[PDB]
């Protein structure tokens, strides 16, 4: 129940990774599209934690302009999807940005804070 009657984030999205201000409350459309966010951390780690699968989410604040964000970054296409990573903590993939829609910006709901 985060999207009020209209399909717009009623709360403000805050990079829960750096308590940064991602999007404002009312500047992002809703998007329950099954998206996939592969932990950009990757890195070596050696052995890993047996969990190379990103997160197949579905809710996403679909914005029509990345300029709306603030200190947000963008994870180059990791194979077939341009993910998004807050520039204050390049990690994500917190947002989803496929190449099919150069204007379909996504902000993984559960992958962000909301107050
Ligand atoms: Zn951040």
UniProtKB/Swiss-Prot annotation:
Residue spans crossing the bilayer: none
MSS4 domain boundaries: 1-115
GO BP terms, alphabetized: membrane fusion; post-Golgi vesicle-mediated transport; protein transport; small GTPase-mediated signal transduction
Gene3D superfamilies assigned to the protein according to its UniProt record, in alphabetical order: Metal Binding Protein, Guanine Nucleotide Exchange Factor, Chain A (2.170.150.10)
One GO cellular component term noted in the UniProt record for this chain: cytosol
Tissues in which the protein is found: Ubiquitous.
Any one GO molecular-function label of the UniProt entry: guanyl-nucleotide exchange factor activity
Assembly: Interacts with RAB8A.
PANTHER family documented for this protein: GUANINE NUCLEOTIDE EXCHANGE FACTOR MSS4 (PTHR13276:SF0)
Family of the protein in this entry: Belongs to the DSS4/MSS4 family.
Function: Guanine-nucleotide-releasing protein that acts on members of the SEC4/YPT1/RAB subfamily. Stimulates GDP release from both YPT1, RAB3A and RAB10, but is less active on these proteins than on the SEC4 protein. Might play a general role in vesicular transport.
Protein name (Swiss-Prot/TrEMBL): Guanine nucleotide exchange factor MSS4
Organism: Homo sapiens
